[PDB]
From a paper:
The model was examined by Xfit, and one region around Asp 139 showed a well-defined electron density (fo-fc contoured at 5σ), not elucidated for the model, the atomic coordinates for this structure were deposited without the elucidation of this density with PDB access 1 WUV. Previous ConA structures showed some poor density regions at N-terminal residues and in surface loops at residues 118–122, 149–151, 160–163. The CGL structure presents well-defined electron density in these loops and is the first ConA-like structure that shows a stable loop in 118–122 region.
We report here the crystal structure of a native and complexed lectin isolated from Canavalia gladiata seeds, describing a new binding pocket in ConA-like lectins, which may be related to pathogen resistance, a site where a non-protein amino acid, such as α-amino butyric acid, can bind. The most recent accepted definition establishes lectins as proteins with at least one non-catalytic domain able to recognize and bind reversibly to specific mono and oligosaccharides. The oligomeric structures of CGL and CGL-αMM involve two 'canonical' dimers, and these dimers are associated by salt bridges between β-strands. In both CGL crystal structures, the amino acids involved in metal binding are conserved.
Residue numbers in the entry:
A (entry chain A), B (entry chain J), C (entry chain A), D (entry chain J): 1 to 237
Write the structure that this text describes.
């Protein structure tokens, strides 16, 4: 199926599938069942920022999500991505709502990838940065309910004309170009991403989350992957 | 018909179609007959560097080609590219051989695009850098004879395994993601590109050159644009 | 004395010294008497952004100042900076108030410098970006009334504890490291800066302006250079 | 006493002071006795590349040294640098020779620091890149025997004009601007550095190595830290 590495901003505790019982940031290596989570004090209606960093020297995938107020949640996991992901991938943002819902608004998203082979100055790099998203954002593949342009933002999941989030929605945006994430003869593979999000819900509890992910290039939304599956996984195995 | 903006490193004078009677650098606005040229002393078998720069504020497209010994040619052209290019483009390198030939070897290629909309820190950006090209370079669209991987280089045109370039070859490499080159709502759009090239004619009678170009996203090698048309234009109008 | 190249955001028309009779953006080459101005619809109390770009291929210094609302003023001037500035310089922000006053608040400031010599990949570069300024900003030399830290901003000129700007104030912030702006054997010298500013005045008219400047390294505020002189020039010659 | 964080490319085993009995790479936290080393097969007379990376999220300092043939050594150390370094530092390269010698030639050096405070797009950044060092390199502080300009390189230690390195030489180059490496209010601090070096011993008995270091801003070469102390430490404690 798809090969997924993701950092999830999981807004809803599905302890049924191994979520801790609080909103959490998590590192997901080919399963929605995070290898590692940290409690995340999600702030309904605040703008937050997630930073995801990997270096292939230290082989440690780290992520922080924070709110200006100051609250901040951190998670790291040792993983050799050489062993997990295909050589070439796509990188994206995914979000979902289920029975409970939230806006999954991306205000900005940036990504830098570096790939060095041994041979002096031999870095390849990709960087993109979106601070504004237009109606027709041709460097993004939008999947599912993802739209761009409304207030210059990427709405990952359905929002009504009056800003009201809809449930059972899933959507993703992938950067258009494949990303070379490792090679046979790589000295340093390394990447980082940042995105700023606004998760707002009128419900008793927001759900389900936003994920930064890295997939096989031809990745698409697994069917049924709204709600707790986060646009990322066909099931909770 | 494609819409092409190019900077050509034109190694062969086709005075026939308006070339000056020497190797030149030129800025091509929708025609192989450059709007502006400068004399260029192509150094056969040496690694050269071309830098292309444009910002939407000064509305000047500028290019330099230089070699390590310090010899360099420069050309600029005042042009408002919103009047020329679609809002969304691909960027690429193109090369051809005709009756005469040369290696059109790209050793590295990088590009930066920035687009700022009205709205305060509101920059979108694309950057990529290839200092090494792999046999399977999925973030490049390879067209015609273009191959990558051969010594970690991009050979835009056909070169036999002994290192000998072939006549009537065209090839191009376009970056995979479309590039947002302008918008209505744009305070600043700007881009710059650099590539290093090894043009070598074992005759020391080189043809036809290399171009950095910007095209409509669906651009392909026009029919019969080997030789002097540099993989860019259907004819010499 | 000092060698100054500046882009001025001149908020006050001193037609006595050659200002056009409206707020204006201007390019100043060793004189406060701009070589080139454009009318600038200054918006008292709005956050604006100025972008300054130079490439040494095109030898055209350009600047745009804009407000999110959408208003935007542009100016360019052909100048070989090789001939104006010393090889090594400092880059800074300057502002002043006089009889009339305004806050000269910098919210952010970034700068990129590139210097290539002929010799393939041989780029030197400096980039810095400040989105927040702390109390003790050791990579900035603060001159005159310039302070950092109050709300994470750089206040270039005196503001009272309640946010009220003071007249006859001058201040500057220079990036700490000297910048190599040209060399003998430079293929491309090129730089750009961005800053976002908030100019607010309670007076009948704001004054006097903010300038992005490039100076000799040992540059200091010319005495008496409050008001129309903008922290930049000892006189209006 | 200076506060030093270093990554050493240590070419000479002083088993005396805890070095392993082979050339190694190591992470030095306030002591020349590395907290972590990895075997390093220094290739005499070849141009190597060292990459150093740290982010404050994963809290792992990682380094690789490699040569073009693909041989590479890697070392990581879990460290929270806020516990080690002052908030404001300088970064630099250091080298020494002692009884044994080697060229400590730096062909290029680059560094990127990012510091994000609580506050939403709130990143401060410093980047510099030297691919060519000039005789008068005003953005470097040169200490001890360090000179620049000689072949566009930085010779950290004394080399005679025939190309022959000298014993008991120390030198360093610190980037001129202080670097904000952490703050209380910091969501993410991270940095990475790269330098390429040519260590050559015309005996093929090299000493003593090169280090990338981060120090208190006022750091100078400690007394008698030629040889094994690498210009970094006053003694071998
Ligand atoms: Ca969940
Ligand atoms: Ca031609
Ligand atoms: Ca004025
Ligand atoms: Ca040693
Ligand atoms: Mn979860
Ligand atoms: Mn031509
Ligand atoms: Mn003026
Ligand atoms: Mn050691």
């Amino acid at each position: 199926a798809d090969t997924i590495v993701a950092v999830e901003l999981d807004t809803y505790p599905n302890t049924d599938i191994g979520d801790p019982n609080y909103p959490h940031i998590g590192i997901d290596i080919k399963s929605v069942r995070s290898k590692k989570t940290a409690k995340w004090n999600m702030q309904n209606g605040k703008v937050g920022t997630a930073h995801i960093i990997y270096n292939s020297v230290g082989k440690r995938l780290s992520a922080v999500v924070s709110y200006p107020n100051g609250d901040s949640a951190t998670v790291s996991y040792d993983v050799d991505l050489d062993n997990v992901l295909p050589e070439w991938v796509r990188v994206g943002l995914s979000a979902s709502t289920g029975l409970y819902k939230e806006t999954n608004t991306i205000l900005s998203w940036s990504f830098t990838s570096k790939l060095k082979s041994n041979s002096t100055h031999e870095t390849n790099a990709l960087h993109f940065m979106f601070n504004q998203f237009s109606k027709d954002q041709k460097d993004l593949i939008l999947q599912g309910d993802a739209t761009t342009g409304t207030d210059g933002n990427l709405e990952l999941t359905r929002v009504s004309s009056n800003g009201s989030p809809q449930g059972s929605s899933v959507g993703r945006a992938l950067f258009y170009a494949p990303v070379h994430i490792w090679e046979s003869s790589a000295v340093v593979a390394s990447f980082d991403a940042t995105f700023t999000f606004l998760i707002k819900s009128p419900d008793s509890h927001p759900a389900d989350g936003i994920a930064f992910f890295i997939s096989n290039i031809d990745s698409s939304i697994p069917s049924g992957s709204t709600g707790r599956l986060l646009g990322l996984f066909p099931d909770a195995n």
